[PDB]
Amino acid sequence: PLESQYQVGPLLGSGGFGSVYSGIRVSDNLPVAIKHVEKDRISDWGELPKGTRVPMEVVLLKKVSSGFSGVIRLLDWFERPDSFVLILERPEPVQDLFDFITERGALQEELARSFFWQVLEAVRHCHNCGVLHRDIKDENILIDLNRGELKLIDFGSGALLKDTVYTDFDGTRVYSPPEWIRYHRYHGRSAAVWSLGILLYDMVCGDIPFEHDEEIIRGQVFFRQRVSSECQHLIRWCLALRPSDRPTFEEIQNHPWMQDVLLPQETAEIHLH
Structure with a gap:
């Protein structure tokens, strides 16, 4: 349930990366960005250490995810019937x-x-x-x-x-x-x-x-x-x-x-x- 943990807001932009909405984490008012990517537009897939099939982008974000503020941090991700949704940090x-x-x-x-x-x-x-x-x-x-x-x-x-x-x-x-x-x-x-x-x-x-x-x-x-x-x-x-x-x-x-x-x-x- 992404809809219960996050409150979606205005569309920030769209393009070859997908559709990115501004949003906020209800647990602590933290500014997040909610990125939707359609499965059929994903051309490169990978596997988590868990062995599960996600978009390559998820794999790479987890590998670089850390407190180091130089790279965007993936806070969560969800699979849907025709798309993946990525919750990222959003500076403000x-x-x-x-x-x-x-x-x-x-x-x-x-x-x-x-x-x-x-x-x-x-x-x-x-x-x-x-x-x-x-x-x-x-x-x-x-x-x-x-x-x-x-x-x-x-x-x-x-x-x-x-x-x-x-x-x-x-x-x-x-x-x-x-x-x-x-x-x-x-x-x-x-x-x-x-x-x-x-x-x-x-x-x-x-x-x-x-x-x-x-x-x-x-x-x-x-x-x-x-x-x-x-x-x-x-x-x-x-x-x-x-x-x-x-x-x-x-x-x-x-x-x-x-x-x-x-x-x-x-x-x-x-x-x-």
Whole structure:
């Protein structure tokens, strides 16, 4: 009974992730998000440790579920005759990075550093839990505006992290690496770093760098805003055409542009309040 434990509210959004309603947990007035996904639209299924057949998205959320606030926490799930319903946490007030960048344009480098750093911590957390997100982008990042903390959301394109090649992909094309566009092959970590270069460019320029396939494959980066040379170097490093020539998470977090990050609370007080 989801209807007794949770009180449903206004539709927050809908798309390739399903239909997400705002809601609240009656047991303690906690702001939740209620996500419905139709079974027939689910194309990837997995198994819980219990051995039961759920959508892959449920599997991945449980694997990454923890108190670490960098990744969205699945609080419960329910199976219905034609759909699954996921109860997720909902920060309040909240704004996703896409809307945030739309409203403000290109971000100051101090703020993009802090945001980018938190995204990297969140992605490292997923990989360390065996989860590959495969759809890192502004739309899938929530900003907890009180605390200055970012949250990675929507694992419905993800997969178990593996070391062998991936030959399928259902994420966002404009964030996908050149080896996927040309060969329909990629490896998890190098693909993720490519999409992080895309995201970081988006943060510091206010739009994504590539739109068409030919642009992704060419990989020429033009900066349309004033961006420091170290930040340009990190971005060009992440968007290297050869996957192996891309920097590891350790190399990104040790990069000179990534030094002296603001704490989340500092971030909120300086740039969000």
